[PDB]
Amino acid sequence: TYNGPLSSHWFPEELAQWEPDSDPDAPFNRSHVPLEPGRVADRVNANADKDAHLVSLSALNRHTSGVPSQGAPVFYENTFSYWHYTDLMVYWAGSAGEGIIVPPSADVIDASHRNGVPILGNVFFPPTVYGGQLEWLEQMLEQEEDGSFPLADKLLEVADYYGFDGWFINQETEGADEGTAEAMQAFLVYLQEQKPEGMHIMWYDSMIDTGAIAWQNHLTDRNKMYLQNGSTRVADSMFLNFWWRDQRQSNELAQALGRSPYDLYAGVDVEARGTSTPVQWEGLFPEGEKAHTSLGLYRPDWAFQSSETMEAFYEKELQFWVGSTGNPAETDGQSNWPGMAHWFPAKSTATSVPFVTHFNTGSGAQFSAEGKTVSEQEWNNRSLQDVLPTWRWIQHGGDLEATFSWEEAFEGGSSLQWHGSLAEGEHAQIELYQTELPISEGTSLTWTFKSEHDNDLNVGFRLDDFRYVEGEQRESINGWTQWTLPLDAFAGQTITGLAFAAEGNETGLAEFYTGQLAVGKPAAPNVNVRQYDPDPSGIQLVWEKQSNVHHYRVYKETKHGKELIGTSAGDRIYIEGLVEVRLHIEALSETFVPSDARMID
Amino acid sequence: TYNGPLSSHWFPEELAQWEPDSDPDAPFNRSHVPLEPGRVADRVNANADKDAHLVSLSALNRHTSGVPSQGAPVFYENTFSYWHYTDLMVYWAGSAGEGIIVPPSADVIDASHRNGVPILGNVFFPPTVYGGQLEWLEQMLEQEEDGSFPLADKLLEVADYYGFDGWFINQETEGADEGTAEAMQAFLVYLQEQKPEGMHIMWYDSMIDTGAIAWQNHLTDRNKMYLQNGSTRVADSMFLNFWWRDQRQSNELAQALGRSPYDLYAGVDVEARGTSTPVQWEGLFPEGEKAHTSLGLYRPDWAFQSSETMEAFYEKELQFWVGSTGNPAETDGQSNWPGMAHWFPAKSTATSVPFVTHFNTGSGAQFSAEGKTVSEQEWNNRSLQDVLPTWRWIQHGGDLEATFSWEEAFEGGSSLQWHGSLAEGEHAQIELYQTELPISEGTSLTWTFKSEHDNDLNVGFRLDGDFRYVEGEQRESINGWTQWTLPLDAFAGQTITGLAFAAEGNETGLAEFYTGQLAVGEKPAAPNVNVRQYDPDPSGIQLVWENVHHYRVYKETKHGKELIGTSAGDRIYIEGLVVRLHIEALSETFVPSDARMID
Numbered sequence A: 001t002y003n004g005p006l007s008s009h010w011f012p013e014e015l016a017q018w019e020p021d022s023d024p025d026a027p028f029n030r031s032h033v034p035l036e037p038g039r040v041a042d043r044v045n046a047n048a049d050k051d052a053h054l055v056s057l058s059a060l061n062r063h064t065s066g067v068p069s070q071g072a073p074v075f076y077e078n079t080f081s082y083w084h085y086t087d088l089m090v091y092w093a094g095s096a097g098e099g100i101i102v103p104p105s106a107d108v109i110d111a112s113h114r115n116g117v118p119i120l121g122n123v124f125f126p127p128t129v130y131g132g133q134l135e136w137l138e139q140m141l142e143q144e145e146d147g148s149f150p151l152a153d154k155l156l157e158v159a160d161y162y163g164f165d166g167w168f169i170n171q172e173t174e175g176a177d178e179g180t181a182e183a184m185q186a187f188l189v190y191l192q193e194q195k196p197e198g199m200h201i202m203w204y205d206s207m208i209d210t211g212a213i214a215w216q217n218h219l220t221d222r223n224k225m226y227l228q229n230g231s232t233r234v235a236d237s238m239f240l241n242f243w244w245r246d247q248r249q250s251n252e253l254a255q256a257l258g259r260s261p262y263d264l265y266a267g268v269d270v271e272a273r274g275t276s277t278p279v280q281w282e283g284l285f286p287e288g289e290k291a292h293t294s295l296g297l298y299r300p301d302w303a304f305q306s307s308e309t310m311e312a313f314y315e316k317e318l319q320f321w322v323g324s325t326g327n328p329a330e331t332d333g334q335s336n337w338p339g340m341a342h343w344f345p346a347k348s349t350a351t352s353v354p355f356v357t358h359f360n361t362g363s364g365a366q367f368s369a370e371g372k373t374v375s376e377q378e379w380n381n382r383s384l385q386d387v388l389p390t391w392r393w394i395q396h397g398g399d400l401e402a403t404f405s406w407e408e409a410f411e412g413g414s415s416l417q418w419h420g421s422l423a424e425g426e427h428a429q430i431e432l433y434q435t436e437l438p439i440s441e442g443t444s445l446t447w448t449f450k451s452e453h454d455n456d457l458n459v460g461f462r463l464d465d466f467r468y469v470e471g472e473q474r475e476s477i478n479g480w481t482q483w484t485l486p487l488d489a490f491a492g493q494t495i496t497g498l499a500f501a502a503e504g505n506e507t508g509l510a511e512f513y514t515g516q517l518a519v520g521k522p523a524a525p526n527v528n529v530r531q532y533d534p535d536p537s538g539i540q541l542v543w544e545k546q547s548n549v550h551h552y553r554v555y556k557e558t559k560h561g562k563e564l565i566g567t568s569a570g571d572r573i574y575i576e577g578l579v580e581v582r583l584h585i586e587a588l589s590e591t592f593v594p595s596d597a598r599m600i601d
Numbered sequence B: 001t002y003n004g005p006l007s008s009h010w011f012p013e014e015l016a017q018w019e020p021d022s023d024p025d026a027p028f029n030r031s032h033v034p035l036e037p038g039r040v041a042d043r044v045n046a047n048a049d050k051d052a053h054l055v056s057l058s059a060l061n062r063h064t065s066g067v068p069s070q071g072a073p074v075f076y077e078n079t080f081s082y083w084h085y086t087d088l089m090v091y092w093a094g095s096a097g098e099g100i101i102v103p104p105s106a107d108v109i110d111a112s113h114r115n116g117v118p119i120l121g122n123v124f125f126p127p128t129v130y131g132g133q134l135e136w137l138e139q140m141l142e143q144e145e146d147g148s149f150p151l152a153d154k155l156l157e158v159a160d161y162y163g164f165d166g167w168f169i170n171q172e173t174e175g176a177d178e179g180t181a182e183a184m185q186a187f188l189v190y191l192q193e194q195k196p197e198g199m200h201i202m203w204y205d206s207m208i209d210t211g212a213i214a215w216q217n218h219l220t221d222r223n224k225m226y227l228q229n230g231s232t233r234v235a236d237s238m239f240l241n242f243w244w245r246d247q248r249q250s251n252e253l254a255q256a257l258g259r260s261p262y263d264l265y266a267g268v269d270v271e272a273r274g275t276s277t278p279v280q281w282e283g284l285f286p287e288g289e290k291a292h293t294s295l296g297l298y299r300p301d302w303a304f305q306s307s308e309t310m311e312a313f314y315e316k317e318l319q320f321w322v323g324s325t326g327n328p329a330e331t332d333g334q335s336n337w338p339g340m341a342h343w344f345p346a347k348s349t350a351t352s353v354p355f356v357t358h359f360n361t362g363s364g365a366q367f368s369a370e371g372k373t374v375s376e377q378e379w380n381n382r383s384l385q386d387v388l389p390t391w392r393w394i395q396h397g398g399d400l401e402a403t404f405s406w407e408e409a410f411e412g413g414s415s416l417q418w419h420g421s422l423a424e425g426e427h428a429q430i431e432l433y434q435t436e437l438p439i440s441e442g443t444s445l446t447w448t449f450k451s452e453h454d455n456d457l458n459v460g461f462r463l464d465g466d467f468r469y470v471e472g473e474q475r476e477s478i479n480g481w482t483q484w485t486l487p488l489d490a491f492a493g494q495t496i497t498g499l500a501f502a503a504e505g506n507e508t509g510l511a512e513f514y515t516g517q518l519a520v521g522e523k524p525a526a527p528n529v530n531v532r533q534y535d536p537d538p539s540g541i542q543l544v545w546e547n548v549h550h551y552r553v554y555k556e557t558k559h560g561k562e563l564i565g566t567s568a569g570d571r572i573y574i575e576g577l578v579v580r581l582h583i584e585a586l587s588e589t590f591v592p593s594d595a596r597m598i599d
């Protein structure tokens, strides 16, 4: 039923002749959210080291084809929220039936970028048993007299146009001779020479020097020529196959090659069993020694795909990325699954003012504006996913639980729920964010919450022990309480952490929903109605995207008030069925100040 | 004489009808060096604070017109080297006779960017006494039914295409009414709404709310609408005029406006007297409490324009930016001119591996490759200016002096000279760089020097968080220069926060070092080069090509290979061709590619 723009995918011959200017969908697939530079690490877990990196190969979209460019009316969508333990994201996709070169969709590029995570697209040369064809490989490996590889040029051009950070190269098609192998090496090297600074090409350990498919599970003499060859750099990293018990040898070989052992990502296959995946952790993270290499997670989206509901999906992600403890700071290294927080510092991109979050998880059963439902429809749009709490979860005192709620929202479709038993006079704190926010005059702390039992919600901030204080100026907005705490008295200081605290009352119960937290007015959007060629009877709204803007909201007038029908963090939005009606487009600033609405007939 | 591409400059009606695709010179005026993000500050001066910023309005080129796009065969050029005390650089230019909208030339954009300094172009509405015309102002302020300002669009387009970071707006043309004033405010507001993130529009404290020209010398009720109007942002900063004795009031007013006092730049006019400029420093930097606002330096290029020689120019810049002490760490706050180091931390963009410097100052009397002269001609090309020492100069022990030398070079036209008396058995160190360089396996320290008296030159590195002085591991001789390599694998996972050198005196009692390369950290593919017409000059041509620090163009002669051109962009204009050429690409590590041959 969906006739809108779709995220792209290609077989090599379609890519060759692909031009953004001629692709009706290309403008919808561009990310307009740059990779946030300079994340800051936390230090709450004593066992976590600073050397090892982590890549995730995640099916952020279950399918390669049929993915709407910019979100969809579906609550249950893969709203991964553990960007903070991730150094590199690989968009897992590609199939013999749909296309083997697949960039990440723009919604996911955006989510990744807000958390300063570089995201790679996938070039998937499938095993013949899965419809793999040598032809496709040979096509990609075509070389001009020039020496250049035209399809490599297309990889770079796609990554440049759509706005992501490189490619994962997965060569599992059998039948390749040694000449093909050398050509692949030339192809990867050509990538290195031509790519923009920062771009990352990650090679899967599969095709060896002979062209045979022969996973090494380590960096060996059989595969090292795909990472580094003497003084020539071939690839930025290698994802090691799963069948290893120890990685010391790869570390040693990497040093002999003059490369960091941490450009090797020891692979762990978690697709089927997630946290029940058996792993020789000592083989990667030895006892008094630093990590032998980095870590590669194949398919953490297990959490999504083995679950039926958003809540079970979110619980499995916590258990997987943080561990059975539910506390990043208190991990059980003796557990079968200690969790990623056991080994990896959490990073935060809350490093710049203004810092704003509405605890938007990226989807919802409903959409709220200033605490009022403005659409009752399921939606996902991971471009609207906020930077979520560094820690999941760190509390002190009370018998409380913290989770995301999709029942209450102030902006978007979720809130942070903090609820349970808190005895009278008892104090509880929840430390949420590692940060690096320079305070200057005019800088305020605001936050917005509901409280079912009337307890007030204090804010907590840590300066370069948390300071817990109550807000200065209170305001009521559709049932929500918004505090503003001026921080002028602290100008010149730097906030390195954000938190909340509450005091129990006679009730003995606490139930908070917090829908905005921030440390820190756009022009009405200039909007044009254009054809979306592939769908007459549909249209697209196109504006000039302002850098002061977090995203755009499209309302349509109804007999029952204004209804939200669209959101975009790009420069356009496709609306179906319009040819067949008054619209209102507002731009919301980074601080979520709404502009005056442009009217469109 | 020179018929090559020239740095641009417009009156408003020329800008209106400008499009890059039709300008033969536009491609030569594009910067290909992005603004380096994330500089790191030093801590060596106890009095320096972290709040106040500093803008320089510098005539990096003496003239608006006649500026070659990419360097010129002139040694004495304004090779400003104090980017480290500068937060914002404004390219000072514009005149009634030449053009009043002028972007920075590509060479200067590049130098600025390498040091992570945002550089602004100039929009100069001149006083009528200087040929100013209200017309030009009215032209710039034209508004469509749309509400948009077409010439503002051209300012943003120029900045985008050429690769710089905004504009300084200088409105000193008399005769403007209150309507013009409001239009200017709308123009500045339109800029804010349309500009790319990061871009900076700085407004001069001149035209007040009535449109009259009435410098306030402070942020007042008469000019605040040009910075901020309620919740609307009008400009990113204001450069306050010079006639102030104190700035507390502007600080206070800025707070009431909900803006940082440090978006205000208290102006100091140093054009005529440089370090002899009288300043009420206490009025800006109160003996305790913070600085009231930021600092605005009008014309530090006094150092260049009041001097006749590179050496005198370089000495005056030291005396101006560092002080009479010659030591950023030991400043005399009681001096008439304590120097900028007295108040401002030095920043460094040595924050990423590979870090490479050849101590190229941007010009030379001569050009060297691997220590051999490959051209005897004066040159300047500030696209080749390296990130130069954070500290000028910090030494311990000996009776030594450090300066730049244009007599000895390993790559380019200059080296760092460290020379004087060092008694046998004595030690001396010179701390050169504040850095932030993650060490990983495969990472080496290299350095390259000549020593007139045979002392060896040790490298110094400080780890996060006293320097480690060690001697190199592998020695190499290259055309009279010694190159040490010191593997740093034993330190992988550590971070270098500082680089230095150290020497031990010998029986000679003398030391004379010239150091031409220092680096913490693969040869490029031969450039794919085409010969194209440079339309405005038949009998001239341009080489155009598509990792790489810069390109070198050699021509074959009866006397060997001669360097005739360098470019950090995608092309170079060569005059007189009409002859075998050789184009090599040099990597960031200065590994040369195989030369493309061109006939």
Ligand SMILES: CC1=N[C@@H]2[C@@H](O)[C@H](O[C@@H]3O[C@H](CO[C@H]4O[C@H](CO)[C@@H](O)[C@H](O)[C@@H]4O)[C@@H](O)[C@H](O[C@H]4O[C@H](CO)[C@@H](O)[C@H](O)[C@@H]4O)[C@@H]3O)[C@@H](CO)O[C@@H]2S1
Binding pocket: A057, A094, A095, A096, A126, A130, A131, A170, A204, A239, A269, A271, A272, A298
């Ligand atoms: C890097 C790495 N690359 C391989 C990775 O490809 C491999 O993955 C597995 O991939 C199987 C094949 O996928 C392709 O072909 C399928 C059928 O035509 C398509 O549906 C698919 O989208 C691809 O184009 C895949 O079928 C595997 O899934 C099956 O087994 C799983 C257990 O591992 C299970 O969880 C599934 O639900 C399913 O039955 C699988 O994801 C991995 C693992 O073998 O190794 C390297 S890592």
Ligand SMILES: CC1=N[C@@H]2[C@@H](O)[C@H](O[C@@H]3O[C@H](CO[C@H]4O[C@H](CO)[C@@H](O)[C@H](O)[C@@H]4O)[C@@H](O)[C@H](O[C@H]4O[C@H](CO)[C@@H](O)[C@H](O)[C@@H]4O)[C@@H]3O)[C@@H](CO)O[C@@H]2S1
Binding pocket: B057, B094, B095, B096, B126, B130, B131, B170, B204, B239, B269, B271, B272, B298
């Ligand atoms: C921001 C700030 N803007 C003004 C700034 O413009 C002003 O500068 C002075 O500017 C004078 C006028 O310059 C223009 O007109 C000249 C003549 O047609 C041109 O040659 C020029 O390039 C411009 O288009 C200028 O003449 C002043 O220089 C003279 O006095 C100097 C002392 O300040 C002296 O050092 C010179 O050698 C010369 O005789 C001067 O640079 C400043 C200072 O008044 O105020 C604000 S800051």
